[PDB]
Amino acid sequence: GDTLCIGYHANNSTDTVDTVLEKNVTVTHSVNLLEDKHNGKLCKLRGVAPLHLGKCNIAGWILGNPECESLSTASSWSYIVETSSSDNGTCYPGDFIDYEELREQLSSVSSFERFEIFPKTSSWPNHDSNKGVTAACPHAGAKSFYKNLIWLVKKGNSYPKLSKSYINDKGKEVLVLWGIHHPSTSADQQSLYQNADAYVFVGTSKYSKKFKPEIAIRPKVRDQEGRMNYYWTLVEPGDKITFEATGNLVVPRYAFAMERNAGSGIIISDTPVHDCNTTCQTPKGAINTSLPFQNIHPITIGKCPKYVKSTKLRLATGLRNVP
Amino acid sequence: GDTLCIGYHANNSTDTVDTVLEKNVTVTHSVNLLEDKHNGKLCKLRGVAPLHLGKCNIAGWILGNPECESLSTASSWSYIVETSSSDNGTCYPGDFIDYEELREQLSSVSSFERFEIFPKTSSWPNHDSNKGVTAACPHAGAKSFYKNLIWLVKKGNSYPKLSKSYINDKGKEVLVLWGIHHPSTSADQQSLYQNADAYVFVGTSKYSKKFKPEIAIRPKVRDQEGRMNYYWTLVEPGDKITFEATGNLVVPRYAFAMERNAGSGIIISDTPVHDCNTTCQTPKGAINTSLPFQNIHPITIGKCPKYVKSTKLRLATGLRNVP
Amino acid sequence: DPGDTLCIGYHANNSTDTVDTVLEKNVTVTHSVNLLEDKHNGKLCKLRGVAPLHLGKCNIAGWILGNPECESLSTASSWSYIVETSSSDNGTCYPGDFIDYEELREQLSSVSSFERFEIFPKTSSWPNHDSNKGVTAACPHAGAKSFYKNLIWLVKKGNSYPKLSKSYINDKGKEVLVLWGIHHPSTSADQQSLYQNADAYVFVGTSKYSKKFKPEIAIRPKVRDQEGRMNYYWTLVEPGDKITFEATGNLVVPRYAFAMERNAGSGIIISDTPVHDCNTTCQTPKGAINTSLPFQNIHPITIGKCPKYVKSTKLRLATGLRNVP
Amino acid sequence: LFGAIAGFIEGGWTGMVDGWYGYHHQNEQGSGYAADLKSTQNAIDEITNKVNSVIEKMNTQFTAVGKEFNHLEKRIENLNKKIDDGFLDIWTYNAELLVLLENERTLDYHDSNVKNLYEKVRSQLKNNAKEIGNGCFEFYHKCDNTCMESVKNGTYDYPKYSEEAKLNREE
Amino acid sequence: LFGAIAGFIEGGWTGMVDGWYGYHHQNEQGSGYAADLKSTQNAIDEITNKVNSVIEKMNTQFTAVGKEFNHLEKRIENLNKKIDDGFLDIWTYNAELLVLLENERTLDYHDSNVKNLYEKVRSQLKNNAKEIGNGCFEFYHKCDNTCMESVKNGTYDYPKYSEEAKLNR
Amino acid sequence: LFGAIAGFIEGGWTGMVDGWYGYHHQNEQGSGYAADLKSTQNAIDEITNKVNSVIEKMNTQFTAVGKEFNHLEKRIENLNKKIDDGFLDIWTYNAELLVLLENERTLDYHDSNVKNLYEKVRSQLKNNAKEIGNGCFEFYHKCDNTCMESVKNGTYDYPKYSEEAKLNREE
Ligand SMILES: *[C@@H]1O[C@H](CO)[C@@H](O[C@@H]2O[C@H](CO)[C@@H](O)[C@H](O)[C@H]2NC(C)=O)[C@H](O)[C@H]1NC(C)=O
Ligand SMILES: *[C@@H]1O[C@H](CO)[C@@H](O)[C@H](O)[C@H]1NC(C)=O
Ligand SMILES: *[C@@H]1O[C@H](CO)[C@@H](O)[C@H](O)[C@H]1NC(C)=O
């Protein structure tokens, strides 16, 4: 007799999926819901490149460590990259106060301009701005210092009361950093600043702090028994910052006008940076995906798939495959 | 030949729902699962009203800024409201130490009473309690000061060592605040307190701190080149607090007996406050709902629906609607 | 009349277990499994086969400082978490702040190796200062005035307090925890009586740490009979690094320090549940949970590899069918 | 999907107003709609339960979401922002999918009820009626209002009409 | 729902003890219950899988929930409380709903199996048997223990019996 | 489960390449496979929708996961670790179960479609064809290519063939 039969597709396929009732069911068609591929590159995020530090810390880079000016300084970045070899930072030993908060705040800026707040050539006529140099920060073989600060020292036999202000006319906020130096011994204090019993004061509308030298011998670090502490503040548009000192103040030379962004981060990685566009970035490489889940890395930056611990998330689209 | 037919309801309805397989399916009956309506009011939470500051900060309110005593001071609140115009705070410039923690601890109190720990009239017979007034804190046109503190100054030519205790007999904890004044110049220090080299000490069973004046000129704020720092501590029932000083102490006048609550918060908003009951409060208005989700505001106080990003969450109850 | 009969049907039984579904409550089923762990063993156990440190009468503070009441404790070189009791009460017996105390307790949570040693031997370390009269009514031992075992309260010898200077280089290959104190007398008479020099100072330093301390002389309200105070400080000295002390008064000096290897995320439980020789992979202040199940309603604050805490009272999964006898 | 709603019964009835599922008879005494009370009532019960479940299982804590951080506390301020955003993302995703999955199942629930109502009837009449399709049965005999209702509550008497029916089934 | 369990087959059998689904015959040689082994076994496999899935997919980190805060850290203490409470609310909600959704589906799964077992049989006998309703078939012919078993494992011989059946029909 | 796929229709067809569901005819003019275009197309639409839903409902915030803490900030460092792990555990569990549940339902969706295609045909032919089982129908009459297609799009003429069919069925 003539016959009509109802049936369903079967094919080549060897994809398997799991269901709640059965494991390893072969299906005709199927789609993976888990992104497991990255591009092995550090990319631009929302079309703007990261700041890449290479040899240096963030500390090394904003203080202006002598090794850190091989870096072309851009006015914009979407996140910051340090490498495992990012080693040049504070070359004169000391605390960098609220360092982590600085690195957070500096994560991502839409505008960033370096400028000379206190021009070296005309700012300090009663103090020595040239002998402020150390074996702890060497440059072309010679004793050197940070590019963005100046270590003032007495001129002849006098350290007169120093007093100096800056008003923020930049229209953005400006980041200013300074240091205070703690000699090893009384002989060193007197030798560098004359006045035993020196003090420093730094002030703005919101900031106010007095500093006194803590004279003692610490364990040798990069050949120094003294120490320098590093400080920073953000001066608001229209506000003024004033320095007053009778010794021990390592003075600002360059400061930074900037416009902070929002939440970005710092990645530490040896993945090479590329001209390359992404919307989700990890320390291993970028993820270009539509998919809701990834297992590449828990710590991402951008607009990212949710990180999961699974190795496969295969969704059935076709039917059970019965050849 | 007569006939019996099986069928199903259809109607007026134009509500649509989405399913995983199909978008925009018209159904006969339907219920929204997402609360999207608020009442545009700030209300009483668990039947007790918030503390509404108006013109003032919390700082200005507990210190007793002269602009802040238009406020009727209740012994109970469920949360605190500041407005975008809440501007009168510390009128003599300085840091308010652990301010944000204070505001957290003061969020919600079941009992709150202001009293005079150190009565002005009898507490300071060897110091001047009347000339402690400034253009930085004006009242009815005249120089004034905070209501809750007194700025003690030398009497004639002497500032004798001051020493004063309070034992907490209130049975609750008491909040005490005090300040320490940093003059602009040596001439001012001596002028106000006589003794160059003054100090202050404040102590309880758990609290101990010495303070020394930091004399220097800061940038002008509300016409002041000196500063004042504000401090606070919670004295436990039975414990004692003692103040010792040879100058620079701005002394407590009023303190606060109180019983802290639990986790409430501070909302800053210009939404008007109403006699009105709610169990969930947002800066935009209150949410009276049975539903599990809302898209009104991520930052709520009370017992709230979960905040989501969606615009509709319509659950089908009836069947597919087929006219 | 009737032809042969074959019927199709399904099991029914004894069972009284009920489950809920989205459409119906309280449906009796034939077979059923609970998904929510609600039983604990009422004991404090070893986590990953290593026992917790149990402090008994003492704080962490009293235990590392070496409060005189705290050396009934056998000091093991390894622990998986720390237990304090509601009676853990002997701590800093001379009143003061313990700086970064909570951080210290976090860091000391769990150590895979821990060894106490004498960094500055009492017998030979302080030939120009008095190391025997540093004792107080605030810290009593066998009826007599005493002090912490792990620190020494140096005082002037005769009429002099010469500038003290003393270093230690960390040769232990692990990090070492060193603690010290600074003492703030009550009055100038006391300061001078104890250390001679009005205007003493203390400095402490490593490669990363540096701090100067000055005495804050004043009378505080009395605690355990004291009007002065002592502050307690600590730091972790990395392998190869050196720590130096310098002082002209007021320094309560280290005697014993601790070589150690920190673990990872453990925690401190405060509980009166007894500790047992007993193995677990999930621990709570009420007792241990030995379970395969994904959820538990015993306690929100657990340590180990645990079921997720939930607020429910039953989570019964149906395995059989609707039961219709 | 069970193949009834917008399936072999291709349309709904705006005429039937007193329930979700029911009948349309046409005999000698007249015609009209009547909702099946028992299965409609049962469905409104179970759907009410589904809605109440999705609402009432939401355990809710008294909490104050907002926190305030100072200018040197951006890290913890950002930590805090991370947790709020983390919760946003899971509550948004779960709510959306919960709605999607339940709707899909509600519609199939209804399809199932309709299909079972149809089969409850075919089961009873057997070959005393012709399956016309479109969920209609044509009786091979006269079926008055009392006969119609015997069908509606499951008490149809098959043998009673078998001879009359089988006569007409030939013709 | 598939309409079988507490449906057109209105009750269960306490008499059938060796399986979840099965048969009750009654012929000339006797009567009794026998569980369908193959479809019972298959179901216990799948339901075991369901239970193991709900349990084994739970990835679990070694962690220590508790944290200690000092009297000047109420804010971060409260932050911490917020994250504990947040998790409590999502795990509680998901667990409750998970159980509700899966139970509904497990009951429907069983309904489906029974309905399919019934149709597997109606398919085979066709008009050699009368559908009585209640999940029973009345044979229009003699069906002995060997005939009964030919039905139970899908090897019923329809033509063999058609004449005998049609005579009685 | 609806009992069709790997059920009463025990195997699939590697021979039918242009769709998910279809027919195999065999008459006098030849034999071959033809996919049912309408129900295949409908299914690919709906399954596309399911995939897109699971993907597109994921709302995603611009965030930077990482945070850096100082040696005296272990507590908040650990607090931060707790939130990252907590999210890990919920997203892992949800994603795994979502996939398991949806797969189970997709497979049953297909089963349902096949079963409805079969019933769509049985419904039309009635006793003009013999249900052989295995999803096949044997016609009691000649059914040519035009007849075959009248079946495939729901326009089979039952009365047209009833006499021819009933002769071959009975006499
Ligand atoms: C920049 O960093 C480099 C390498 O990280 C430093 O070079 C080392 O200096 C040390 C300490 O003085 C010497 O003993 C070694 O010879 C150098 N080591 C290596 C690995 O090259 C250098 O001191 C840093 N300079 C600045 C200015 O930061
Ligand atoms: C109070 O606030 C206003 C407006 O915000 C300000 O102009 C005024 O000087 C303040 N005065 C005091 C005493 O705080
Ligand atoms: C230890 O604790 C007890 C309990 O109150 C106290 O009386 C005693 O003085 C303490 N001893 C020391 C040395 O702290």
Residue numbers in the entry:
A (entry chain C), B (entry chain E): 0 to 322
C (entry chain A): -2 to 322
D (entry chain F), F (entry chain D): 2 to 172
E (entry chain B): 2 to 170
Please share excerpts from the published article on this structure.
The pandemic H1N1 virus (2009 H1N1) was unique in that it had a gene constellation from both North American and Eurasian swine lineages that had not been isolated previously in either swine or human populations. Phylogenetic and antigenic analysis of the hemagglutinin (HA) gene revealed it to be distinct from seasonal human H1N1 viruses but more similar to the classical North American swine lineage. The receptor binding domain The receptor-binding site (RBS) is at the membrane distal end of each HA monomer and its specificity for sialic acid and the nature of its linkage to a vicinal galactose residue determines host range-restriction. To this end, we have cloned, expressed and solved the structure of a pandemic H1 hemagglutinin by x-ray crystallography.
Expression and purification Recombinant HA protein from A/Darwin/2001/2009 (H1N1) (Darwin09) virus was expressed in a baculovirus expression system utilizing a thrombin site at the C-terminus of Darwin09 followed by a trimerizing sequence (foldon) from the bacteriophage T4 fibritin for generating functional trimers, and a His-Tag to aid purification. Although protein was expressed as a trimer, only monomers were purified by gel filtration after foldon removal by the thrombin cleavage step. However, monomers were still able to reform trimers in the crystal as evidenced by the structure reported here. Overall Structure By using x-ray crystallography, the structure of pandemic H1N1 HA from the Darwin09 virus was determined to 2.8 Å resolution. The overall structure of Darwin09 is similar to other reported HA structures with a globular head containing the RBS and vestigial esterase domain, and a membrane proximal domain with its distinctive, central helical stalk and HA1/HA2 cleavage site. Darwin09 HA was found to be structurally very similar to the 1918-pandemic HA and the pandemic potential H5N1 HA in comparisons. As for other HA structures, the Darwin09 RBS is composed of three structural elements: a 190-helix (residues 184-191), a 220-loop (residues 218-225), and a 130-loop (residues 131-135), while other highly conserved residues: Tyr91, Trp150, His180, and Tyr192 form the base of the pocket. Although six asparagine-linked glycosylation sequons are present in the Darwin09 HA monomer, interpretable electron density was observed at only 3 sites in HA1, Asn23, Asn87 and Asn276. At these sites, only one or two N-acetyl glucosamines could be interpreted. Results using recombinant HA revealed a strict preference for five human-type sialyl-glycans, with no significant binding to avian α2-3 receptor analogs.
